[PDB]
C-alpha cells in the first residue's frame, strides 16, 4: 500500500504457524503485555480483531542472539556516574540488575540530579529507590516503541487504544499525485524512507551529468559512469501507483548516501503520507454528527487529495479438441460499430477510453469442421473504466516460455484517477477517523477575518470522552509553525524559554519542526509561542493567545458569537473508498447443487438473510414477507420465472411453491439408509418429484 506497510511487514513477530498456537486454542494469558517486553516488543502496535496479541512488531533498538533470544542495549553506570559503554542484555540477565529510566535528569558530568529515581527491579517491580544502587540506564526514551508508533507526535498525551488505532491506520494510506512533508513531525521519517528502499540513493560520489524524467547519469571521480533508471507508473500489489521522480539538477555535486530520486510517499527524502489542512473545531448544522466530516470544494478543484489506481486483465489462448483458439479482429457475431477501437491483431490500442461492458481483446473458438466460430472475448467487467496504458503480449512461436497447452498470452493495463467524494474515509495520526458527510462550496464555509475559508470541520464532542488530546496540541503547534514566530530578548530570555535552544527562538513562515515521541515540546513552551507569532500581510493577528479565532458565517453573514479553535492538522486518505463497496442485484447467476444466488461482488452475488434476521421477522409478525424472502427469491425455481413475468406484465404475484433445498436434504437423509417419507392426511406418501 505504501512504504511504511512494506517496512512493517518485514519486522513482524507471529505466534502462529506450523509449530505454534491456534486462534481458538490461545487463551487470555498469551495475549498480555508481559513486563519483559520492555525493549523487545511493542505494547501498542497490534491487530484489533481476533488476532489481538498474537502478532507484534520488533522494537527499533532490538537485535537477535545467535540462539534466538532478543537483546536490547543499556548504558553502564558506576559510582553514580553514567558512562558511555553499551552492553546488550537478554531478558534473563536484566532481572538481576537495577535498571534506571530514560527520563532522568543528568548533569554535565553525568550525575543524577534528583535524590531518588524510578527504576525497574527483578520481577518488573517498579520502585522509587535512592539513586545510589542503579547499575544500568536506558539508551533513549523511544527504546520501547516500533517504527510506526515512533511517528506520532505528542504520543504521551494519547490513550493506548487511540494510539493503537493511529498506528494501525498509518499503514493504510494511499499515495497521492503530489506529496508534501508534515509541518510538525518526529524525526523518524527520514530513516524510515531510506531503509524502506522506495527511494534511489547514490552508491558513490560524483557530479550529475544528465537528468531526464526516466534516467540520471552520474560521473564518478575515478572516471566510471553509472546510470540509474526509474519506474514510471508501475502497479503495486494492491493496485496503487509506484512512481519515482528525480530531485537533482544537471550540475549538482552528489555525495555517497545522498537521495537522488523520490518515491511513492516521499517528499525530498522523508516520508509524507498526507496533507496539511486548516481545521476548525465546532459543530456545524449536524453534518458532522457522530464522527462525520465536512470538507471544502477547494480540495476537489485543486487536486489536493487525488490518487491513481491501476488495474490488470489477462486472457489465454489455448488449443482445443475441436481446434485451436486464435486471437483476431474478425468476429462474425458482433457488429462493426463496436470493433472500431481494435487494431490489426484483435487487441485495443493504447490511449482508448474503455467503459463497462466494452471490448478489450477479440477471440473466437472453432467448433469443428464453415460457421463453427463461437464468440469468447475479454470484456471490461461491470462498473469499471479508465484509459489503456500498456499491453504485453507473449507468444509461443517467438521462442518464449509458456505453459503447456496454451499458445498466446496478453495483458492489458487500465488506469483511472480518483478524486475525493462522499463516503471516503479520512484519518489522522492520533485516532481520528470518519467518513465524509458533505462537501461544501467555498462560499458556504466559515472564514477568518481576512476572508480565508477553512478546509475541514471536526466535531468537539468526540475529543474529551476518548482521551486523545494530542490532536489539539498538534493543531496549536502547526498554526505556530505555519505563521512563524519570534521571541523577544530585549530584557534577556524569558523564564519560560530558558530550556529552549538558541535556534528555536526565531522561525520563518512555513517552517518545519520536530517533536520526538517522549521528549518534545512542553506546554509552557507552546503557551509562550502562541503569543509570539508573526502577523500577516496587514498588521493583524488572527489567532489570540488561547489559539482561538473569531469566524464569520458564510450562509448568513453574521459573526459567530464565540471564538473557535483554528489551526493546521495532518490528514491522510485511507484505502477504503465508496466506489469499491457499492453493489446491487435483481437477478443473475445461480448455484448448482442448491439453486440459490451466488455470493460475492465479483460474481454478481446476493446478500445473505441469516438466522438472526429471521428472528426479527418472526418477532414483527410478518408471515408473508418471510415466506416470499425464503421461497420465490431464493429457491423456488418455477416461481421465479412466473414472478418475473407477472412483474413485467403488470399482473399479480403468484403463490410460492416448494424450495429445492428441502429435496436436497431429503435425498441426503435417504443416502444414509434412513427411510424418511412425507405423508398426507390419510397416509399415501406423496411423490415429491413433480413431472406431471
Amino acid at each position: 500500500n505504501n512504504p511504511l506497510s512494506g517496512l512493517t511487514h518485514k519486522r513482524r513477530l507471529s505466534a502462529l504457524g506450523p509449530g505454534g498456537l491456534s486462534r481458538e486454542r490461545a487463551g487470555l494469558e498469551v495475549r498480555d503485555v508481559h513486563p519483559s517486553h520492555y525493549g523487545r516488543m511493542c505494547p501498542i502496535e497490534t491487530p484489533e480483531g481476533p488476532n489481538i496479541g498474537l502478532i507484534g512488531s520488533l522494537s527499533v533498538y532490538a537485535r537477535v542472539n545467535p540462539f534466538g533470544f532478543i537483546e536490547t542495549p543499556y548504558r553502564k553506570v558506576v559510582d553514580g556516574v553514567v558512562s558511555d559503554e553499551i552492553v546488550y542484555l537478554t531478558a534473563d540477565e536484566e532481572d538481576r540488575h537495577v535498571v534506571a529510566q530514560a527520563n532522568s535528569p543528568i548533569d554535565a558530568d553525568g550525575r543524577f540530579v534528583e535524590p531518588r529515581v524510578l527504576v525497574r527491579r527483578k520481577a518488573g517491580e517498579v520502585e522509587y529507590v535512592p539513586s545510589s544502587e542503579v547499575d544500568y540506564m536506558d539508551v533513549s526514551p523511544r527504546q520501547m516503541v516500533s517504527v510506526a508508533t515512533a511517528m506520532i507526535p505528542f504520543l504521551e498525551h494519547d490513550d493506548a487504544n487511540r494510539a493503537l488505532m493511529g498506528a494501525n491506520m498509518q499503514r493504510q494510506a494511499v499515495p497521492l499525485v503530489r506529496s508534501e512533508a508534515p509541518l510538525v513531525g518526529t524525526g523518524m521519517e527520514l530513516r524510515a524512507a531510506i531503509d524502506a528502499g522506495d527511494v534511489v540513493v547514490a552508491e558513490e560520489s560524483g557530479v550529475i551529468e544528465e537528468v531526464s524524467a526516466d534516467y540520471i547519469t552520474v560521473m564518478h571521480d575515478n572516471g566510471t559512469r553509472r546510470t540509474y533508471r526509474m519506474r514510471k507508473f508501475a502497479r503495486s500489489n494492491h493496485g496503487t501507483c509506484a512512481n519515482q521522480c528525480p530531485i537533482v539538477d544537471a550540475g549538482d555535486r552528489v555525495e555517497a548516501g545522498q537521495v537522488i530520486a523520490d518515491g511513492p510517499c516521499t517528499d525530498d527524502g522523508e516520508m509524507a503520507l498526507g496533507k496539511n489542512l486548516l481545521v476548525a473545531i465546532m459543530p456545524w448544522e449536524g453534518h458532522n454528527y457522530e464522527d462525520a466530516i465536512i470538507l471544502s470544494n477547494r480540495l476537489v478543484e485543486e487536486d489536493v487529495l487525488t490518487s491513481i489506481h491501476i488495474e490488470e486483465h489477462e486472457i489465454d489462448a489455448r488449443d482445443t479438441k475441436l481446434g485451436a483458439e486464435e486471437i483476431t479482429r474478425d468476429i462474425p457475431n458482433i457488429s462493426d460499430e463496436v470493433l472500431a477501437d481494435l487494431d490489426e491483431r484483435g487487441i485495443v490500442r493504447i490511449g482508448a477510453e474503455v467503459r463497462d461492458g466494452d471490448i478489450l481483446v477479440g477471440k473466437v473458438t472453432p467448433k469443428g469442421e464453415a460457421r463453427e466460430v463461437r464468440d469468447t472475448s475479454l470484456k471490461v467487467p461491470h462498473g469499471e473504466s479508465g484509459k489503456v496504458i500498456g499491453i504485453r503480449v507473449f507468444s509461443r512461436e517467438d521462442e518464449d516460455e509458456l505453459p503447456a497447452g496454451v499458445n498466446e498470452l496478453v495483458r492489458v493495463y487500465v488506469a483511472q484517477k480518483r478524486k475525493i467524494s462522499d463516503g471516503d474515509k479520512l484519518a489522522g495520526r492520533h485516532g481520528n477517523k470518519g467518513v465524509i458527510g458533505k462537501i461544501l462550496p467555498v462560499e458556504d464555509m466559515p472564514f477568518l477575518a481576512d476572508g480565508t475559508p477553512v478546509d475541514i470541520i471536526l466535531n468537539t464532542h468526540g475529543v474529551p470522552r476518548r482521551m486523545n488530546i494530542g490532536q489539539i496540541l498538534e493543531t496549536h503547534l502547526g498554526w505556530c509553525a505555519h505563521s512563524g514566530w519570534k521571541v523577544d530578548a530585549a530584557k534577556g530570555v524569558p523564564d519560560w524559554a530558558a530550556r529552549l535552544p538558541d535556534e528555536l527562538l526565531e522561525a520563518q513562515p512555513n517552517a518545519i519542526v520536530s517533536t520526538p515521541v517522549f521528549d518534545g515540546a512542553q506546554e509552557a513552551e507552546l503557551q509562550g509561542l502562541l503569543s509570539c507569532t508573526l502577523p500577516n500581510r496587514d498588521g493583524d493577528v488572527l489567532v489570540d493567545a488561547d489559539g482561538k479565532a473569531m469566524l464569520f458565517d458564510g450562509r448568513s453573514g453574521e459573526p459567530f458569537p464565540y471564538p473557535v479553535t483554528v489551526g493546521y492538522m495532518y490528514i491522510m486518505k485511507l484505502h477504503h473508498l465508496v466506489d469499491d463497496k457499492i453493489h446491487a442485484r435483481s437477478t443473475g447467476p445461480y448455484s448448482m447443487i442448491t439453486q440459490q444466488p451466488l455470493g460475492g461482488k465479483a460474481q454478481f452475488g446476493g446478500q445473505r438473510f441469516g438466522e438472526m434476521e429471521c428472528w426479527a421477522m418472526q418477532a414483527y409478525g410478518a408471515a408473508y414477507t418471510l415466506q416470499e424472502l425464503l421461497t420465490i427469491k431464493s429457491d423456488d425455481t418455477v416461481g421465479r420465472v412466473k414472478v418475473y413475468e407477472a412483474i413485467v406484465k403488470g399482473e399479480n404475484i403468484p403463490e410460492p411453491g416448494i424450495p429445492e433445498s428441502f429435496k436436497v436434504l431429503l435425498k441426503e437423509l435417504q443416502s444414509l439408509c434412513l427411510n424418511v417419507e412425507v405423508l398426507s392426511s390419510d397416509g399415501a406418501a406423496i411423490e415429491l418429484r413433480e413431472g406431471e
Binding site: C614, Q618, Y620, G621, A622, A623, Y624, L626, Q627, L630, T631, D635, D636, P656, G657, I658, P659, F662, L674
Partner: protein
C-alpha cells in the same frame, strides 16, 4: 425431530428418531420456515388469513 436436529447433536437425535420411528406434525415456527410455509403467528394465523372484504351496499349502489 426436525426442530431438534437443527439445534445441536444431529447424529444422536437422528439415531434416536430412526430407532423410535418418530413422526413430525410440522406445527412450529422452525419447521414451517424449513419446509416453506406460513408461520403460525402474526398475520399467518387462521383468523387473519381468512378475512373476506367487499364494498358496502350503499357505496356499491352509489357507484
Amino acid at each position: 425431530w426436525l426442530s431438534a436436529a437443527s439445534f445441536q447433536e444431529t447424529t444422536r437425535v437422528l439415531t434416536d428418531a430412526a430407532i423410535n420411528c418418530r413422526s413430525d406434525k410440522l406445527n412450529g415456527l422452525k419447521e414451517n420456515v424449513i419446509i416453506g410455509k406460513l408461520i403460525p403467528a402474526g398475520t399467518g394465523i387462521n383468523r387473519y388469513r381468512n378475512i373476506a372484504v367487499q364494498p358496502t351496499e350503499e357505496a356499491r349502489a352509489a357507484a
